[PDB]
């Protein structure tokens, strides 16, 4: 071993052993790489002790582009030197700051009641006339420096290749139980550079492992203590050193406490409290440390409770918000301080729901298991994008804050705790003080003594953060009996885990199918098929209430029931996050299955976190073992063109059997070449995976058929015995999406040519060729069905929280949306009026046509005008479906196609200026286009139908409409919405036909992600 | 003076209401104007959008020119370098976002000792060691550097 040899060589050199110098290098500790396509032998003798490196597109054609993935450069530490500035000098540190930093080691590897620390203080008393501290334990020795900062390691490689890799540092969990001295940064950088040099000319996907080879160079950290037996008293040199010297008063001394006997929930609460308060303090400071990884290390995912951690985080954010309102508001005009506290808390939560290092912590683990206890919507994407995870975080904290707005809140643990990572006056002061601010501000109103106390508290915060002392008056404000924990944050929650079941899944809903067959014979007929139009409308997509990751499981269940399809096991390739896979699993409980999906990583940042499993497998709970590759699918190829993927599938089948009886290829391909390659691949592998009596389901489009000559029908049709093209009742309204079903495998092929002439008589029976009315009828027929049957409440967003957050997205305030949502449950029998009221308040809070300000208002912008049209058309769909307004449905379709008319103006009246828009005039055009935003247009319909629950609705009443509107503004009513905003002009079918839209532009920054651990 | 120039740039950018990244060491400054748009229906609309992009860019650059003129500093508009796929800062090219290192300038300093430094066993080898490390830092697959 090189580390042991270095140790004994230093021993021979200096006559006695040393410490905090030797560091093992990753060249023998990790060794060469072990590629995953190879069986990777050391993955059997051990577990999570390795570093993984994945490359979804190889290392080919470098320097032609940036690359999609971020780059890990190294340590956050600075070097104090740069080749780019040699003329500059080395950044040094003054002797006073190098001597006062030695107190960091006052109870780390020394003892206060000793002859060494006495000398450490004698030095300061020597060089300065200025005449026992905190506790440190559980850290390395070579990570200690005053004259400089410990580096850890920096990169020695360009970014062109680093932007094409992703490394994983959460695969070293087994080594996390101990506190070894090796470095994570150097190991990850070795992994990156070796994976780059060893896979330079590789063009397909790759995955490499780095396992611990030389176990001798682990060197667990011990608790060492330095001491001397001698007296060194340096003479005073303060009187002879004031010339170049130009120019620590008070410090709280927290007590230690029994941290071991504390239960795990309280430990989670305390660490969450500290983390939340520190994050709030840094965010109100507008610092960059808030976006660091140390605040939210991934080393506590599986070693922390969820409820306790999140409740502590909430309490800490609230306490920090309390310590900011005094520095933002004016106590004179202040009233209802709890409103300000809640506003600061919402601010902190909305800022934390976009933090990479936080969403990675909550991306997979017990924290996410707690976040999903609350009803919600399943993520639609493969590994959850930061926005799809922020939605979950916001939903959870909105459920946990609904009790705060009731006025009843209190910390679950009156006693407080601290750690070494937050050990400083700038943190301890406001943290100790927040206990008083909570009681003084959360209560409804204020009094004179409260205002005086708050002014004294603002002055005290100024004195504490500014390093100034305090008098003997402020003692009543501090927190009494505040304790401390010696360990740090990521080395304190060292407790175990304790105690799965399957939720109640009934018979989900189904629908009928429409099938057209195709027969094969040697006679080559002509390929004569009229191409269908590429029309899009989310109406049925909005009807489907059971929003598992997509509304596709309806279709697969319908096909399975309507063609007599049974299966022991299955193969599902192309799904996003296991939706169709989970459907096939829960429709046959005695069924294992293979899952394949393409790994999206653009909109998903990862600070060393491995890709989570697909989210839809949460539908099963603890029954995930039936998906054989649910927790290993990301370390293997996924592209359906690479034959290595199908080799991996055959390897699974061999090593586990599964007697596969079904293959489902559901995906949306963007080019004909990819589809042709997929077809050539499944040609050469179906006989080995599928049985003779097996079934295949390949999704495709009639457009791709009529366009391309070579397609799935000409390829996969002959080799199977029976073949059909089917559409479904729970399919999009106007689409060419057809599922090619194929039952039975032929031994030999003598019928390669199809008979297109027997398709023309039925190619017009597709939904794309049918008119909009014949699909509106089917939409109504499907809306009557109970699509939400057999689905537990754990996997559905609550309707009244859903509409609340949706309005909150569309410019509407929080409390206004809360009241407007509660008003839907107050009397759902008249919901048309309430939906039109939602439209009114949305168009009011996006474009105010009442407020008369002195300055002429600026014209609308993108996002402020897009949400208007989105909400309007999404609610008009529902109104037409509820009142048979077919012309309004056609109008919605047209505006989805051409544009949504908006025409803006500013009128001058007493007061001077007020804005005003319509949909017919020649005013300023803000005509927006909505074609990549059908998902919100469907979410609106889904929310409204979730509220309705098949209940009959009353007609529209303007009286109740104006009554609701007056709760928002007295001048808002059905009259004002007719001559100043053009919403009645829209509903009553009077709009601008000429598409006056233009491509939108904006000067917005580009979010380039990268970090330094 | 660099702080002064940056104050000018920030002020004029906020007046234009334009987003800008900035790199500066003094006389050499790169002011990167950033834009984003949506999916286009045709090539004409895209080309028009690009025309408007360059128009807004030259607008902010004219504003910065006027500011530096009010301060008594000139900006030669015939020598300003504009590009949407190339950058240069500190004699360090950035081609299509990828950073590139000038290898030949480093090997040209082999055996070239520094000021007040005699050719020596320890000094002449640093001339190759430092330059090989520098070549490897700004290059992928540091195999050529070893050879």
């Amino acid at each position: 071993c090189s580390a042991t040899h270095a140790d004994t060589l230093r021993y021979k050199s200096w006559g006695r052993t040393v410490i905090g110098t030797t560091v093992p290098h990753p060249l023998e500790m990790l060794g060469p790489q072990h590629r995953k396509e190879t069986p990777c032998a050391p993955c059997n003798t051990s577990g999570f002790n390795y570093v993984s490196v994945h490359c979804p597109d190889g290392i080919h054609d470098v320097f032609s582009s940036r690359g999609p993935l971020p780059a890990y450069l190294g340590s956050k530490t600075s070097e104090s030197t740069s080749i780019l500035q040699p003329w500059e000098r080395e950044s040094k540190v003054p002797l006073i700051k190098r001597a006062t930093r030695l107190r960091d080691a006052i109870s780390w590897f020394v003892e206060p009641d000793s002859k060494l620390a006495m000398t450490i203080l004698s030095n300061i008393h020597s060089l300065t006339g200025e005449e026992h501290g905190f506790k440190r334990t559980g850290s390395a020795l070579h990570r200690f420096s005053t004259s400089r900062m410990s580096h850890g390691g920096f990169a020695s490689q360009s970014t062109a290749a680093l932007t094409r890799l992703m490394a994983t540092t959460d695969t070293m969990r087994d080594l996390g139980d101990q506190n070894f001295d090796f470095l994570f940064q150097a190991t990850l950088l070795y992994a990156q550079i070796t994976t780059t040099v060893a896979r330079d000319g590789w063009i397909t996907s790759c995955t490499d492992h780095y396992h611990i080879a030389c176990k001798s160079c682990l060197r667990p950290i011990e608790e060492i203590t330095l001491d001397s037996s001698m007296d060194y008293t340096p003479p005073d040199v303060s009187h002879v050193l004031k010339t170049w010297r130009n120019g620590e008063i008070k410090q709280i001394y927290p007590l230690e406490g029994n941290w071991k006997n504390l239960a795990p929930a309280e430990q989670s609460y305390q660490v969450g409290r500290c983390i939340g308060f520190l994050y709030g303090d840094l965010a109100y400071r507008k610092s960059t440390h808030a976006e660091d990884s140390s605040l939210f290390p991934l080393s506590i995912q599986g070693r922390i409770r969820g409820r306790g951690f999140l409740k502590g985080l909430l309490d800490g954010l609230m306490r920090a918000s309390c310590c900011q309102v005094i520095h933002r508001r004016s106590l004179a005009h202040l009233k209802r301080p709890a409103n300000a506290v809640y506003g600061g808390l919402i601010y902190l939560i909305d800022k934390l729901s976009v933090s990479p290092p936080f969403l990675s912590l909550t991306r997979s683990g017990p924290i996410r298991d707690e976040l999903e206890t609350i009803p919600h919507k399943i993520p639609t994407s493969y590994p959850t994008s930061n926005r799809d995870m922020g939605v979950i975080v916001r939903n959870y904290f909105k459920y946990q804050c609904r009790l705060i707005e009731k006025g009843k809140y209190r910390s679950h643990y009156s006693q407080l705790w601290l750690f070494s990572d937050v050990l400083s006056i700038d943190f301890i002061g406001p943290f100790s003080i927040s206990t008083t601010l909570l009681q003084i501000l959360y209560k409804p109103f204020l009094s004179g003594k409260d205002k005086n106390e708050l002014r004294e508290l603002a002055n005290l915060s100024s004195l504490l953060r500014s390093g100034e002392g305090w008098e003997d008056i402020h003692v009543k404000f501090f927190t009494k009996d505040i304790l401390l924990c010696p360990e740090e944050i990521r080395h304190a929650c060292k407790f175990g885990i304790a105690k799965m079941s399957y939720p109640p899944w009934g018979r989900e809903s189904r629908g009928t199918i429409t099938t057209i067959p195709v027969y094969y014979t040697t006679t080559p007929y002509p390929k004569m098929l009229e191409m269908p139009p590429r029309i899009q409308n989310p109406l049925l997509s909005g009807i489907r209430l059971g929003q598992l990751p997509t509304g596709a499981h309806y279709k697969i269940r319908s096909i399975l029931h309507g063609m007599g399809i049974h299966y022991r096991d299955f193969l599902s390739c192309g799904d996003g996050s296991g939706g169709m896979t989970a459907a096939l699993l829960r429709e046959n409980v005695h069924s294992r299955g293979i899952f394949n999906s393409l790994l999206e990583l653009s909109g998903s940042v990862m600070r060393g976190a491995s890709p989570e499993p697909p989210s839809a497998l949460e539908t099963l709970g603890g029954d995930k073992s039936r998906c054989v590759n649910g927790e290993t699918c990301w370390e293997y190829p996924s592209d359906l063109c690479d034959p290595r993927t199908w080799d991996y599938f055959l390897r699974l089948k061999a090593g586990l059997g599964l007697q596969i009886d079904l293959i489902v290829m559901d995906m949306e391909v963007r080019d004909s070449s990819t589809s042709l390659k997929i077809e050539t691949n499944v040609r050469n592998y179906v006989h080995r995976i599928l049985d003779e009596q097996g079934v295949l389901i390949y999704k495709t489009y009639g457009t791709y058929i009529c366009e391309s000559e070579k397609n799935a029908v000409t390829i996969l049709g002959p080799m199977f015995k029976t073949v059909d093209l089917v559409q479904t009742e729970f399919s999009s309204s106007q689409t060419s999406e057809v599922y090619m079903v194929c039952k039975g495998l032929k031994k030999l092929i003598d019928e390669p040519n199809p008979d297109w002439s027997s398709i023309n008589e039925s190619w017009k029976n597709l939904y794309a060729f049918q008119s909009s009315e014949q699909e509106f009828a089917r939409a109504k027929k499907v809306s009557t069905y109970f699509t939400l049957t057999g689905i537990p409440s754990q996997f559905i967003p609550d309707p009244f929280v859903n509409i609340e957050t949706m309005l909150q997205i569309f410019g509407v305030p929080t409390g206004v949306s809360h009241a407007a949502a509660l008003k839907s449950s107050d009397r759902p029998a008249d919901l048309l009026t309430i939906s039109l009221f939602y439209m009114a308040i949305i168009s009011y809070y996006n474009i105010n046509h009442i407020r008369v300000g002195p300055i002429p208002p600026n014209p609308p912008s993108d996002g402020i005008a897009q949400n208007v049209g989105i909400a309007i058309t999404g609610i008009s769909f529902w109104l037409s479906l509820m009142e048979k307004d077919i012309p309004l449905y056609q109008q919605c379709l047209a505006v989805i196609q051409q544009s949504f008319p908006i025409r803006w103006e500013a009128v001058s009246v007493k007061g001077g200026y007020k804005q005003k828009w319509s949909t017919r005039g020649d005013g300023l055009p803000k005509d927006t286009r909505i074609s990549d935003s059908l998902a919100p247009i469907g979410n609106w319909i889904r929310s409204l139908e979730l509220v309705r629950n098949q209940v009959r609705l009353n007609p529209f009443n303007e009286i109740l409409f104006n009554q609701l509107c007056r709760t928002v503004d007295n001048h808002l009513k059905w009259s004002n919405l007719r001559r100043n905003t053009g919403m009645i002009e829209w509903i009553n079918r009077r709009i601008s036909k000429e598409d006056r839209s233009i491509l939108m532009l904006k000067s917005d920054l580009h979010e380039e992600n990268s970090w330094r651990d | 003076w660099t702080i002064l120039n940056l104050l000018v740039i920030q002020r004029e950018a906020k007046i234009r209401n334009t987003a800008v990244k900035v790199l500066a060491q003094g006389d050499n400054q790169v002011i990167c104007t950033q834009y984003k748009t949506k999916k286009s229906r045709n090539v004409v609309e895209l080309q028009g959008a690009l025309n408007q992009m360059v128009s807004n860019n030259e607008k902010i650059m004219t504003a910065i020119k006027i500011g530096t003129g009010k301060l008594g500093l000139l900006i030669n508009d015939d020598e300003t370098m504009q590009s949407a796929d190339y950058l240069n800062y500190g004699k360090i090219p950035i081609f299509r976002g990828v950073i590139r290192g000038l290898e030949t300038k480093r090997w040209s300093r082999v055996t070239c000792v520094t000021n007040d430094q005699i050719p020596t066993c320890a000094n002449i080898m640093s001339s190759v060691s430092t330059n090989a490390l520098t070549v490897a830092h700004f290059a992928e697959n540091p195999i050529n550097a070893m050879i």
Binding site: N339, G407, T814, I984, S1003 | -
Partner: peptide, 28 residues
């Protein structure tokens, strides 16, 4: 038969803080 409603520059800028009036707690 009928429903229950019937009449009788080119580049956007870069910028387009807190909220305390949008919320209101209750007590008891």
């Amino acid at each position: 038969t009928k429903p229950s409603y019937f009449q009788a520059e080119q580049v956007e800028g870069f910028i387009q803080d807190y909220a305390d009036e949008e919320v209101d707690v209750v007590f008891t």
